[PDB]
Amino acid sequence: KGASDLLRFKIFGMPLPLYAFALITLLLSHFYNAIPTDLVGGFALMFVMGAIFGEIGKRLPIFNKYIGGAPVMIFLVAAYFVYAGIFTQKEIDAISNVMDKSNFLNLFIAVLITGAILSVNRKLLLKSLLGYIPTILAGIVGASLFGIVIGLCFGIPVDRIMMLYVLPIMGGGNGAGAVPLSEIYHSVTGRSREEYYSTAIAILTIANIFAIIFAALLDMVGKKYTWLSGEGELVRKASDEKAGQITHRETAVGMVLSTTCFLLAYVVAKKILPSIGGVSIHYFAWMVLIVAALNASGLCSPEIKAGAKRLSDFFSKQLLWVLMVGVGVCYTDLQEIIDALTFANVVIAAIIVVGAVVGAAIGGWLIGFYPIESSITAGLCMANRGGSGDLEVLSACNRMNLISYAQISSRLGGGIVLVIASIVFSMM
Amino acid sequence: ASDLLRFKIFGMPLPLYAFALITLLLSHFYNAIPTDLVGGFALMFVMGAIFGEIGKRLPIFNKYIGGAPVMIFLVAAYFVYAGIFTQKEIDAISNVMDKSNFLNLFIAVLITGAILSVNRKLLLKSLLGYIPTILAGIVGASLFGIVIGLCFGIPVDRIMMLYVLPIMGGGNGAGAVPLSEIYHSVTGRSREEYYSTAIAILTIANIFAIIFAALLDMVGKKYTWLSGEGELVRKASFKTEDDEKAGQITHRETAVGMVLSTTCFLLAYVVAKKILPSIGGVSIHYFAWMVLIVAALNASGLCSPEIKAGAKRLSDFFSKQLLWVLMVGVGVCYTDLQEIIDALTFANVVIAAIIVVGAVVGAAIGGWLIGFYPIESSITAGLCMANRGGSGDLEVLSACNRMNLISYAQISSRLGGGIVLVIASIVFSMMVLE
Ligand SMILES: CCCCCCCCO[C@@H]1O[C@H](CO)[C@@H](O)[C@H](O)[C@H]1O
Ligand SMILES: CCCCCCCCO[C@@H]1O[C@H](CO)[C@@H](O)[C@H](O)[C@H]1O
Ligand SMILES: CCCCCCCCO[C@@H]1O[C@H](CO)[C@@H](O)[C@H](O)[C@H]1O
Ligand SMILES: CCCCCCCCCCC
Ligand SMILES: [Cl-]
Ligand SMILES: [Cl-]
Ligand code: NA
Ligand code: NA
Ligand code: NA
Ligand code: NA
Numbered sequence: 001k002g003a004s005d006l007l008r009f010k011i012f013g014m015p016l017p018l019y020a021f022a023l024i025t026l027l028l029s030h031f032y033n034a035i036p037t038d039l040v041g042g043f044a045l046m047f048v049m050g051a052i053f054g055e056i057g058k059r060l061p062i063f064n065k066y067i068g069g070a071p072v073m074i075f076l077v078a079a080y081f082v083y084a085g086i087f088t089q090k091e092i093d094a095i096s097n098v099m100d101k102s103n104f105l106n107l108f109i110a111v112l113i114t115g116a117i118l119s120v121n122r123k124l125l126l127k128s129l130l131g132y133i134p135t136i137l138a139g140i141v142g143a144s145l146f147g148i149v150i151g152l153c154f155g156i157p158v159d160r161i162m163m164l165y166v167l168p169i170m171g172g173g174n175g176a177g178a179v180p181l182s183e184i185y186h187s188v189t190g191r192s193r194e195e196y197y198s199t200a201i202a203i204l205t206i207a208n209i210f211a212i213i214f215a216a217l218l219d220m221v222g223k224k225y226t227w228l229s230g231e232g233e234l235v236r237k238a239s240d241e242k243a244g245q246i247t248h249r250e251t252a253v254g255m256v257l258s259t260t261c262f263l264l265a266y267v268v269a270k271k272i273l274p275s276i277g278g279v280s281i282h283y284f285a286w287m288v289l290i291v292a293a294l295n296a297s298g299l300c301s302p303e304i305k306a307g308a309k310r311l312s313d314f315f316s317k318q319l320l321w322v323l324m325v326g327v328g329v330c331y332t333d334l335q336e337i338i339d340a341l342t343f344a345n346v347v348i349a350a351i352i353v354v355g356a357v358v359g360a361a362i363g364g365w366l367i368g369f370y371p372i373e374s375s376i377t378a379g380l381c382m383a384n385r386g387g388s389g390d391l392e393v394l395s396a397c398n399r400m401n402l403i404s405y406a407q408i409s410s411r412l413g414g415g416i417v418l419v420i421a422s423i424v425f426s427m428m
Numbered sequence: 429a430s431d432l433l434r435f436k437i438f439g440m441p442l443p444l445y446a447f448a449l450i451t452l453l454l455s456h457f458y459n460a461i462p463t464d465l466v467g468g469f470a471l472m473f474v475m476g477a478i479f480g481e482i483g484k485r486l487p488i489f490n491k492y493i494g495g496a497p498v499m500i501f502l503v504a505a506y507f508v509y510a511g512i513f514t515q516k517e518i519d520a521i522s523n524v525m526d527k528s529n530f531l532n533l534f535i536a537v538l539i540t541g542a543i544l545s546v547n548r549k550l551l552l553k554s555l556l557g558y559i560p561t562i563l564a565g566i567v568g569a570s571l572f573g574i575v576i577g578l579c580f581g582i583p584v585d586r587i588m589m590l591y592v593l594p595i596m597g598g599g600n601g602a603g604a605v606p607l608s609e610i611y612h613s614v615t616g617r618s619r620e621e622y623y624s625t626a627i628a629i630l631t632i633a634n635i636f637a638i639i640f641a642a643l644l645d646m647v648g649k650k651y652t653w654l655s656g657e658g659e660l661v662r663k664a665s666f667k668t669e670d671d672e673k674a675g676q677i678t679h680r681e682t683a684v685g686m687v688l689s690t691t692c693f694l695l696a697y698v699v700a701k702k703i704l705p706s707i708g709g710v711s712i713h714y715f716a717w718m719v720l721i722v723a724a725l726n727a728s729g730l731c732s733p734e735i736k737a738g739a740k741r742l743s744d745f746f747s748k749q750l751l752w753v754l755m756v757g758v759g760v761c762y763t764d765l766q767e768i769i770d771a772l773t774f775a776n777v778v779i780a781a782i783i784v785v786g787a788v789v790g791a792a793i794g795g796w797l798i799g800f801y802p803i804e805s806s807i808t809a810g811l812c813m814a815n816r817g818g819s820g821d822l823e824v825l826s827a828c829n830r831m832n833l834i835s836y837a838q839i840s841s842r843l844g845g846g847i848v849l850v851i852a853s854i855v856f857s858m859m860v861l862e
Binding site for chain 2: 048
């Protein structure tokens with residue numbers, strides 16, 4: 001009464017005959033057009049589909065190194081499946097339930113931020129942030145100048161370059177970027193929001209792709225020129241030590257802390273402190289500060305801090321490929337890229353991203369940060385689109401541990417862009 | 429004084445929990461909370477934590493009623509009844525439970541983790557003796573339940589649905605909860621009317637399963653031929669462990685258990701909806717198909733022992749770290765307080781006790797015929813079915829001083845518990861057909 005025994009070769013921990021069973025199930029669901037629009041239905045598809053295009057992206061000879069590898073193959077194959085029509089409407093719905101309705105994206109980011117920040121030493125927190133802010137500024141200045149120089153060459157005035165190209169790309173992505181950008185444009189120029197948003201969303205999305213490619217490239221550069229890489233680390237020589245016994249309970253507390261620290265940040269940002277100075281504070285920017293305060297407070301035992309890291313490790317190593325399926329489906333839209341895929345737009349955007357890379361490399365190097373991780377966090381993770389872009393880039397360069405800096409770039413840096421945007425939109 | 433701040437609420441030291449509690453209070457009074465997985469889990473973690481810890485430390489509650497999970501769903505139901513929850517808080521819990529369907533995932537994980545945790549060889553050996561002995565206990569509990577039900581003027585369909593099947597089910601979250609979904613899927617009636625009655629009868633029966641366990645031991649000493657004190661069979665002559673070599677255990681294997689849980693559900697879902705939506709006139713619910721599927725997956729040997737252990741680890745995480753979250757949801761979506769109180773009847777106590785008796789009569793007879801000792805059989809295949817899942821097994825075996833039979837009680841709670849889900853689907857469907 002035995003069909004088989006386990007084979008040798010594994011796909012996502014699953015030997016071929018076992019993965020076959022899973023794949024067949026997904027094929028049955030597909031052809032019979034039957035899948036629950038749930039976490040169960042979503043995760044079922046996302047796991048199985050993520051598993052196959054992950055192992056392929058991990059083994060594709062030229063692709064794995066200079067393109068982001070496994071997560072980028074998944075990210076692109078899934079985006080293609082939507083564009084082509086290979087996905088059922090309800091398969092799309094199932095993935096959308098997970099990523100947007102259930103908000104697995106926010107859960108994913110919140111778990112990672114909590115694991116990253118609670119794992120660091122208290123004395124190290126405030127100093128990193130103080131050195132990270134001017135590093136962001138250099139990336140903006142770098143992205144601006146490169147976009148202007150490439151702008152005038154194509155016969156593009158300064159305004160169109162800053163308003164339609166630089167700011168959307170360097171802004172906080174979609175919801176907290178192109179959308180409030182679309183407001184200010186309409187709230188000043190008086191034109192339609194759609195004419196700005198449609199252009200902005202298409203431009204920054206192209207730049208997002210380049211930021212993903214460049215991330216994989218900068219990872220290679222850092223192995224070629226070791227002196228430039230922190231090999232994951234951003235701060236020079238930086239990371240209660242008593243790693244006690246660790247139970248499932250302490251890992252569960254990590255999820256308690258991740259969701260609770262988000263909840264507090266949500267309340268503060270939506271009801272208590274929506275804007276400090278002229279700058280608005282996204283709830284993920286508030287969450288970074290809250291987790292930092294929770295670290296500095298001393299309220300978390302090192303076994304609980306270890307639990308938050310262990311959960312963050314489960315997510316980033318076991319649910320990453322699932323997430324990339326959802327991000328490829330929900331936050332790409334290949335058509336909007338192609339409808340704007342003018343090799344004038346491609347060049348301006350790509351150069352602007354390079355401008356952010358160069359500026360942030362220069363900035364952090366002056367600060368005392370590693371040149372490679374400076375251009376990825378304060379450069380690429382500004383020129384990408386929000387948290388979805390942060391997870392694409394950091395997975396492509398295999399630096400998911402830098403999620404907190406990336407979020408400071410996406411949220412706090414994107415809010416800074418908003419201020420600049422309000423000015424540039426006003427004067428001219 | 430400093431002794432106090434060392435006290436833990438769900439793994440959180442008292443000052444750290446206060447932070448989490450203050451956070452929930454601020455969200456409540458500013459009326460601000462995301463109605464997604466983040467806001468929901470935060471609410472359900474914090475709320476489940478405090479009332480779970482209170483539930484554990486109330487004497488009659490922990491020993492008789494069910495402790496933490498019971499206190500949680502009762503209090504969460506009270507928050508709805510008394511309008512303590514805001515609308516957003518109710519939306520957040522409901523969205524997690526039904527819209528995101530964290531309930532199906534939870535049940536999918538439990539079923540997968542429980543059945544795959546079973547040794548393959550032991551699984552097949554059970555089909556020749558121990559599983560039939562389990563079936564006899566269900567038949568026994570059925571016959572006794574119908575009769576006592578009749579004497580009280582309770583129809584057969586209600587006795588089977590609200591009394592017998594929950595009692596012989598795999599407890600609360602592994603029995604009454606998935607039984608409510610199957611009921612609602614076949615009947616069309618609210619799951620709240622099923623669960624609220626089922627969980628009360630469950631709790632009463634579990635008490636009698638413990639009391640009878642002690643009695644069966646006292647009987648086993650007086651009638652020594654019934655006992656074979658300690659052992660179930662007559663040949664093995666050694667109890668400790670016989671294993672499948674499980675070595676490495678990483679996050680990858682537990683994540684595979686998540687793949688298997690979510691994929692085995694998908695297969696059971698397609699079968700129930702598009703492939704085999706009705707064998708006979710009987711519609712088999714996907715929870716029932718999943719039991720058969722997951723049991724089959726174990727039989728095929730396709731899964732490595734390291735992956736089986738990964739499924740069990742994920743199952744253990746959900747059942748010990750996420751159960752208190754689920755019970756907040758259970759109280760909000762499955763609980764009618766009046767239906768529970770109305771079920772707390774001396775009549776229901778009597779019916780419950782006799783159903784449990786029927787389980788020990790059925791399992792003794794059927795076990796006597798197969799080659800098992802009557803006393804132990806009635807304890808392992810009778811009482812450890814009639815009790816409240818794994819927690820009940822520990823209470824029952826403690827009362828009869830037979831913790832060595834724990835492997836057999838595990839088969840009852842897991843295999844026989846999923847089998848009840850299959851029987852229930854078949855029985856529920858047959859009852860609505862005219
Ligand atoms: C390995 C995958 C085998 C797939 C076999 C099932 C093929 C689908 O089967 C059919 O799909 C039709 C839609 O095209 C439906 O209308 C039918 O109800 C269904 O039977
Ligand atoms: C306001 C507080 C700012 C927090 C900055 C991010 C800290 C969490 O990020 C951590 O940074 C560490 C050193 O910087 C690195 O060693 C870790 O890999 C990274 O996870
Ligand atoms: C007499 C009018 C019909 C009965 C109205 C009261 C029904 C219960 O309604 C309300 O339930 C909640 C729980 O106590 C509380 O908010 C109120 O005290 C109670 O009035
Ligand atoms: C939707 C919640 C995802 C569950 C993740 C469980 C992580 C358990 C880690 C066990 C080592
Ligand atoms: Cl709100
Ligand atoms: Cl309200
Ligand atoms: Na951006
Ligand atoms: Na970003
Ligand atoms: Na039971
Ligand atoms: Na049991």
